[PDB]
Amino acid sequence: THSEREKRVSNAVEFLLDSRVRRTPTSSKVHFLKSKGLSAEEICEAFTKVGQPKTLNEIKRILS
Ligand SMILES: COc1ccc(CN2CCc3c(c(C(=O)N[C@H](CC(=O)O)c4ccccc4)nn3CCO)C2)c2ccccc12
């Protein structure tokens, strides 16, 4: 069964794949994901898993 970390990342992946979401800016999505309890590293992992890679620095800059 999945760890809580795995559940967060999986939920994020399914989110980032939605067609409406894909049209929403990166910054809004990153703030959203942080509101669901994802760390910057977990957010960065989800973006890579869907083939929309972002640097960790980019995600950190949004969250700062
Ligand atoms: C920041 O921009 C937005 C946030 C939310 C929504 C609403 N839903 C879009 C589709 C969607 C959502 C969610 C979602 O919020 N899932 C959970 C919520 C929960 O269980 O608390 C979740 C997502 C990410 C991380 C953790 C949990 N999942 N999916 C895909 C499967 O339907 C949320 C948006 C819809 C259109 C465009 C932008 C959206």
Side-chain angles (χ1 to χ4, degrees), residues 2-64:
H2 290 13
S3 70
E4 292 305 309
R5 181 183 202 285
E6 287 166 335
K7 296 173 184 173
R8 288 194 293 279
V9 173
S10 181
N11 282 154
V13 163
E14 289 317 296
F15 171 72
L16 290 175
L17 292 171
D18 177 284
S19 57
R20 298 154 306 158
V21 173
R22 285 177 70 197
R23 298 171 200 119
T24 299
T26 300
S27 64
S28 294
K29 294 183 296 204
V30 166
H31 290 297
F32 169 83
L33 289 171
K34 176 175 178 66
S35 84
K36 302 299 192 174
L38 278 76
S39 65
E41 287 180 37
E42 287 160 16
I43 290 170
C44 188
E45 176 167 318
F47 274 104
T48 287
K49 289 188 176 258
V50 298
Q52 298 167 35
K54 304 289 175 277
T55 61
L56 186 62
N57 273 2
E58 186 186 342
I59 290 161
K60 285 174 184 174
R61 185 188 321 131
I62 294 163
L63 295 175
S64 80

